[PDB]
Design a binder for this molecule. Sequence first.
Ligand SMILES: Nc1ncnc2c1ncn2[C@@H]1O[C@H](CSCC[C@H](N)C(=O)O)[C@@H](O)[C@H]1O
Lengths: 265, 265
Amino acid sequence: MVLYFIGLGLYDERDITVKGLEIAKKCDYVFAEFYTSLMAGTTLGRIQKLIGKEIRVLSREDVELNFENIVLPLAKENDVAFLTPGDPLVATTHAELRIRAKRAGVESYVIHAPSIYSAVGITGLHIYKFGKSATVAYPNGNWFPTSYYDVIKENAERGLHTLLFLDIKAEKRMYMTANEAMELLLKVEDMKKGGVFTDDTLVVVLARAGSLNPTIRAGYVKDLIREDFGDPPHILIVPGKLHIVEAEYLVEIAGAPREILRVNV
Amino acid sequence: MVLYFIGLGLYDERDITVKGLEIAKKCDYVFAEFYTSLMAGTTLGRIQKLIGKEIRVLSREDVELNFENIVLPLAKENDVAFLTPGDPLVATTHAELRIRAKRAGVESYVIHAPSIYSAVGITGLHIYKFGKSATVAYPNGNWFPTSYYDVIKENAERGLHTLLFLDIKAEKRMYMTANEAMELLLKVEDMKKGGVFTDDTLVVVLARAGSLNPTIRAGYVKDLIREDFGDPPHILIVPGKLHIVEAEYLVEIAGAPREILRVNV
Ligand SMILES: Nc1ncnc2c1ncn2[C@@H]1O[C@H](CSCC[C@H](N)C(=O)O)[C@@H](O)[C@H]1O
């Protein structure tokens, strides 16, 4: 009669909360989805071993089309867990699943875990200064999406930072790198000429957040566009005007050039 | 020797990540602060029992003025942990403490935990649609803060949601309720008259996120301003223009008036 939405956190199998782990262990059935994002620092086997339960992985279609036929039936007469990378319900499509549960007469509870949305605090950038978020999508065929560029423009002109989630080919475990994202933005700039993203733009790259050794780097595009930030996942941030305290953290912790203390504050 | 900043999460001691618990358990000295937020579902005793170590609680003054004299000295020859509610670097000024650590020759690491900043996803509002955030601060004497009102205006103008962290006075055990926040906003509205926050404004209240049964309510200020949302902590959200699915969740899950289902595109 109960469905638990449990977040797995940022990077590896230990990023789940003690609460989520203990509840997961007592559930009769455990499902999981790895299409909204991936857990790059672990494997399904390591997660299974930690929880001590078989993990039934579900595809985007299984969830979007058949959640009520695959998960809810069992949740009706058993305690069921639905694991998701990060924090449950951050992914836009997750919330609606709680309505399906209600419609099926199934109780649902949410067990939170760290999300990249809040983990970016490790960049030294003030969380309240982040504006609207966006996703940099790979251009495909005759389709070249560019809305993420406008998001940066609108946030930056208000002195706000822009968090850019990078595209992922979940089914192929292929992550877009911050380098590729920078190349794409420079390409959109050349097409829109809004003076939003150029070689002189200050950016921040956060790689493998959650890991004990994430890569945190800040600098101008011209210098970071070909830098190696390590293994995925990568997150790209285009900060707005900085508070001196943010700038000093970027210089001391993220290796930003001293120049940002006078150009971007 | 090392210094770990470890988040304890949203509500109780089990909101810490498995990673954070594993590391905290093996540290030589454990410090913590409980003035940046309120964990309504636990006690110092239960947290101490979980990590198996005595926890030295520090006041805001101990931290801001003497972190380098109380904590860092030990981190030079021992493994030290510094615990905080939620995520240690979200809506706090703790990031600056990493700079103090560096200058003291002490390496520091960050272990994330569930944060209210991302937990708001449980309200059904799309996380990417949240704009700049703000804090509703208790007026002090003749000084009446109002910057948060302008933030709401700026976000709403762009169709974005506004997350409003509510004030806290730990040493005085004062935790601002959503009701008090609403009263303050109505007063600012009478003073500025921007039509930003009135009795007809739709708002969302999230109380005690992290617990299994948090209070999630949506409705007009006129109706919720005197409603009992339970014990603190509380957070208030002023949604921008709603997507149809957001409206559906607010009605089905947060008990919002069915009339909001009719979005004015
Ligand atoms: N469990 C919870 N439920 C509702 N609001 C919460 C909350 N935890 C924190 N807040 C809100 O945030 C304020 C503290 S701001 C510090 C937040 C913390 N670093 C984090 O990551 O969550 C509180 O006064 C309250 O308004």
